[PDB]
Amino acid sequence: PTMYGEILSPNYPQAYPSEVEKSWDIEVPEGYGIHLYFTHLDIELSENCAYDSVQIISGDTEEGRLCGQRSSNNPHSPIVEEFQVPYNKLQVIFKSDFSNEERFTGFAAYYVATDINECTDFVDVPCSHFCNNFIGGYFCSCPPEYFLHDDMKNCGVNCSGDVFTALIGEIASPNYPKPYPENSRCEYQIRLEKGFQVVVTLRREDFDVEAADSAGNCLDSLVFVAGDRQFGPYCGHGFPGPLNIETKSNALDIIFQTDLTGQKKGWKLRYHGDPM
């Protein structure tokens, strides 16, 4: 694991021996790519570089096979051949055949590690909101009052915590009646004494959540969990369920989950205990 280095042909800068087969495994750290460039190339020329050749293998494909005698036509650089790969590993192989008629001096080449911009180079952004690239990695950041989930990728608001124990109460989505936040998971816990069940009361007009997709699946969802029984998911304009919902349990979890896009008014419900 290195940041740079050189690769010289056997007996460089003098003639390379015949019947040789040397290999180099290049490895830079993760989050880095590799820039490989040749500053010297003096190898026996042949069709498809059959006899003598230097070979470059990156990842799973062959990047190049080099032979012949070529110099730098640009006076401002000694580079005659270069390669740029987005992988942290690279392979160089040099083969010389049985005999060398002329004076061939082989090759000199150098490699340096290059940073990957995970924020732009990747096909799909690794952050829900903002991506911050640095050298050897990247990190995700969130807008004000948003917080980074345990995956260090998704941002959401803090809309959990309070446990409800009162025999009657009122619960509403964040920022009600202004639009609710995105990419968040809100959790409300209602805990009544054993003799009572939790009854939820939701007015039809007090409920506006993003509509479900064409398949009928809710992207943002409101769900009531009572032990084994589940109520919902609920979606759409207007509460789909009944006005009075008997959960038949003294313990209820209300989980409102949102995705990254599409926010509407939200909801407001009331709960009350009922003797059993």
Ligand SMILES: [Ca+2]
């Ligand atoms: Ca040879």
Ligand SMILES: [Ca+2]
């Ligand atoms: Ca990076």
Ligand SMILES: [Ca+2]
């Ligand atoms: Ca949404």
Ligand code: NA
């Ligand atoms: Na050489």
